[PDB]
Design a protein around this ligand. Structure first.
Ligand SMILES: *[C@H]1O[C@H](CO)[C@@H](O)[C@H](O)[C@H]1F
Ligand SMILES: [Zn+2]
Length: 472
């Protein structure tokens, strides 16, 4: 049967199913309603940065249509909606004056969600640093971000926390550090060879450290000031793709484990254990910032749940570790990616080149977190796949590969949960086709099709799949 035996009965009691978007990717009204620019507005408005020179000025216009979209997610039997608050829509300069029209939008959205029985899961940050803070403070290179972020978080907790009980601070700090400061392909476009400046061997580590300190500071403020009255929770969202040793050799197993540690351990070791992974300490040495004991104790235990963004898997091949002149965070791992074993590809690719369809990667990742980190509460906060540009409406709607994707991945998640993994929810990326960063509108991740000429929504087969699977 097309559900492949899946339904709410196949998951734990009260398990949460939702869809996910982010502010810049769906809201539109980027320079309206009092919103100040983010680093992504500046980046996307620069010729050549995004496919087609596209930007999120209008995006899906969820700003005007949010009741349509909430009605749609309710009709598809979802329980929750993960979305983000645009920092520069609340504080156009990142600090100081509040944009009340921006506050009113999120109040209206939250209140409508609650009216329709959809639980809001709210991210405070999703790549969209206020441009004013990048320019004034140097963004995530500056430890002062902990204070600036905490003050923004405090405002959001005070303003929305009587209603919002499920928060996340950040989305994928690894990707900000990697793309923004190692490879230099996302804002602020910093890297060793980059026009904006930078250093791919040091800045990714500074940036990751400042995300951890800022998360920890925001959660401390929540706990000491808001939690008693509001009784909510705050987590963080981290990407984790699976790494599988190419062979059972000691060097290949070591390589796969090094990749896990540099990918997810970079954040989870501090959040669970109060220190960076030993391998990172050993290889990155002086380029890896050191937490003071007090900072370590602030960071450890600071996530009430861990959001995991899971898409894909790779094989890893290793050799003996060697002394090498530092060049980049990426090179520090001393691993070799391989996308075939025994002459067979690990999986077929979706539209995005990095996205190999490998459902057992979901089991791999969830099992590994369960076994390595004492089975923390995990929420799968992003999972999905994309179609390419230029298809007809009907071709978008007949998204049979995405239907297969969700059925297979959710089956593998169910396998991990049935084996005891403490997974509390699952969120499909994305409710809607949207602005896919450097791909612009050329990558379609939605379970609902969006016609980017007319802005019309049309649910795809995968939307009806969810509606059927999730019926109460
Ligand atoms: C997770 O991945 C999707 C697909 O690349 C992005 O659109 C989201 O912003 C990111 F959070
Ligand atoms: Zn509009």
């Amino acid at each position: 049967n097309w559900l492949g035996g899946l339904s709410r009965a196949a998951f734990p009691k009260r398990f949460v199913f939702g869809t996910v978007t982010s502010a810049y990717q769906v809201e539109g009204m980027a320079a309206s309603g009092g919103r100040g620019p983010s680093i992504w507005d500046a980046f996307a408005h620069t010729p050549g940065n995004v496919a087609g020179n596209q930007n999120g000025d209008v995006a899906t216009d969820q700003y005007h249509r949010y009741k349509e979209d909430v009605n749609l997610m309710k009709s598809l039997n979802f329980d929750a909606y993960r979305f983000s608050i645009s920092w520069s829509r609340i504080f156009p300069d990142g600090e100081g004056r509040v944009n009340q029209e921006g506050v009113a939008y999120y109040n209206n959205l939250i209140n409508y969600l609650l009216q329709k029985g959809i639980t809001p899961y709210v991210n405070l940050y999703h790549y969209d640093l206020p441009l004013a803070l990048e320019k004034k403070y140097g963004g995530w290179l500056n430890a002062k971000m902990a204070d600036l972020f905490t003050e923004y978080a405090d405002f959001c907790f005070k303003t929305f926390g009587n209603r919002v009980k499920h928060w996340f601070t950040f989305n994928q700090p690894r990707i900000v550090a990697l793309l923004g400061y190692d490879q230099g392909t996302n804002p602020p476009k910093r890297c060793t060879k980059c026009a904006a400046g930078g250093n791919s061997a040091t800045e990714p580590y500074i940036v990751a450290h400042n995300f951890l300190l800022s998360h920890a500071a925001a959660v401390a403020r929540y706990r000491t000031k808001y939690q008693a009255a509001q009784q909510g929770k705050v987590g963080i969202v981290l990407d984790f793709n699976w790494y599988e040793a190419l062979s059972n050799s000691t060097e290949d197993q070591a390589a796969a484990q090094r990749a896990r540690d540099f990918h997810i351990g970079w954040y989870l070791d501090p959040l669970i254990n109060g220190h960076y992974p030993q391998i990172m300490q050993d290889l990155v040495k002086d380029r890896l910032p050191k937490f003071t004991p007090e900072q370590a104790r602030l960071v450890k235990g600071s996530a009430d749940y861990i959001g995991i963004n899971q898409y894909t898997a790779s094989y890893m091949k290793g050799q003996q570790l060697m002394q090498q002149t530092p060049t980049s965070y990426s090179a520090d791992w001393q691993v070799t990616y391989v996308f075939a074993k025994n002459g067979k590809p690990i999986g077929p690719q979706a539209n995005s080149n990095w996205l190999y369809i490998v459902p057992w990667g979901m089991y791999g990742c969830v099992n590994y977190i369960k076994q390595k980190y004492g089975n923390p509460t995990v929420v799968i906060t992003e999972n999905g796949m994309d179609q390419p540009a230029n298809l007809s409406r009907d071709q978008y709607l007949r998204d049979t590969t995405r239907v297969h994707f969700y059925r297979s991945y959710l089956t593998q998640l169910k396998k991990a949960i049935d084996e005891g993994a403490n997974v509390a929810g699952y969120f499909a990326w994305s409710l809607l086709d949207n602005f896919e960063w450097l791909s612009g509108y050329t990558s379609k991740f939605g379970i609902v099709y969006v016609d980017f000429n007319t802005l019309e929504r049309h649910p795809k087969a995968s939307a009806y799949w969810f509606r059927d699977m999730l019926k109460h």
